[PDB]
Amino acid sequence: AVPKGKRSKHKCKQRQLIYFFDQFDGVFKRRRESFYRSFYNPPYFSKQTEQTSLPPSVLRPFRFPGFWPGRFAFKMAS
């Protein structure tokens, strides 16, 4: 069995939107939610990337300085 005609641009656009919503609500929202929940734990440190990665760390940066009420850096010692 084969198509009897060419699918139109209008219907292809409709399909684009429908598949976008399907993939969004089926994969992308869930993956983003899991990613944002993982932030409450120290970032994963792969032992196979030791040779080139940074030393292990736990701190997660606050990336909007305009909303930070505390101190940004400590004065140089002497």
Binding site: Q16, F62, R63, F64
Partner: protein
């Protein structure tokens, strides 16, 4: 997965999504969205953004069309472009990137000028404005159909939100878009733009081609294609007034910012005052109830849009200035150096 999750369909609904229903529902949605706005009840002026380079190009081309001559020509005439011509008839005009550079220059100049204008705190400016960057990446081995998904995800989001989005997807070929976003953010920061208020305003996909390979089958030989595409992203630094009206009044706050606030509170990296400090932006419930409180205060005429905007802008600017001063002090710099850094 949940196996009972509600997956959305933009064209059909059980409740009835015929065209008349869509019309009525979207009229309701437009009304609600407009009523979500709080507007100042007193302003001195209604300044609107204009692009001098675009206006000059428009007038230049209008003159060329109306007189058949370049502006200032008296003897010769305008010569349109023909096949094989190596001269651009509109070479005197700036390119799109040059116009963007001139826009950034004008924005900087107007920002500096506004700091010495009386009544600058009572002026309405509107949505548009601010600096704009256009960044392009080529040779992406992805097709239009997938790029449309990945760009519809991030359109309209703050840059860090978009980066988090695309990083959460665990897709190998989205590394191209992630590289573009990271490089653009680094470039804007180095040029002095405030990463905190840079949004992805629009995208554009430009095909480049497709490499074809034979695929030998039972009765025929096919050609399988690998795409070649380029992506152009438009980043915009929102002016401080627009940033205030978006985050504070309409409660459209970056989830990256909200997550950082919640992580700080959970880890006790800030004081107890931070809870009330960040109440207007912290969570959905706090944002909703603060919006209700602001609406009631505005309807009783106790809320002051201009005073609130000034307080928000001053707090933001002072936090940034403190960051700069303390990072300088962490180096052991001299008082003269620190003072000269502020000029």
């Amino acid at each position: 997965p949940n196996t009972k999750r509600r997956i959305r369909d933009p064209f059909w609904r059980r409740s009835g999504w015929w065209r008349w229903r869509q019309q009525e529902v979207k009229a309701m949605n437009r009304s609600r969205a407009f009523r979500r706005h709080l507007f100042p009840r007193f302003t001195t002026e209604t300044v609107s953004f204009v692009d001098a380079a675009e206006a000059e190009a428009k007038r230049f081309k209008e003159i060329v069309a109306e007189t058949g001559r370049y502006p200032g020509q008296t003897v010769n005439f305008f010569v349109p472009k023909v096949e094989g011509a190596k001269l651009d008839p509109f070479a005197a005009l700036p390119s799109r990137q040059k116009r963007l550079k001139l826009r950034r220059k004008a924005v900087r100049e107007a920002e500096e000028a506004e700091k010495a204008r009386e009544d600058a705190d009572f002026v309405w400016r509107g949505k548009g404005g601010g600096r704009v960057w256009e960044e392009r990446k080529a040779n992406i081995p992805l097709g239009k159909k997938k790029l449309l998904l990945y760009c519809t995800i991030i359109k309209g989001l703050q840059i860090t939100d978009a980066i988090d989005w695309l990083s959460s997807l665990c897709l190998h070929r989205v590394n191209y878009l992630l590289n573009l976003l990271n490089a653009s953010r680094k470039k804007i920061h180095e040029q002095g733009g405030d990463i905190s208020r840079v949004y992805v305003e629009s995208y554009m996909l430009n095909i480049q081609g497709q490499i074809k390979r034979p695929q030998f089958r039972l009765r025929m030989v096919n050609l399988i294609k690998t795409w070649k595409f380029a992506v152009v992203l438009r980043f915009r630094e929102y002016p401080m007034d627009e940033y205030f009206h978006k985050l504070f009044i309409l409660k459209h706050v970056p989830r990256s910012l909200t997550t950082d606030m919640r992580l700080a509170l959970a880890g006790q990296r800030v004081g107890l005052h931070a809870v009330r400090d960040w109440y207007p932006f912290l969570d959905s419930k706090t944002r909703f109830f603060h919006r209700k409180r602001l609406k009631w205060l505005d309807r009783t005429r106790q809320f002051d849009y201009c005073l609130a905007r000034r307080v928000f802008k001053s707090k933001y600017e002072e936090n940034c200035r403190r960051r700069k001063i303390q990072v300088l002090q962490a180096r052991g710099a001299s008082d003269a150096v620190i003072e000269e850094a502020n000029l």
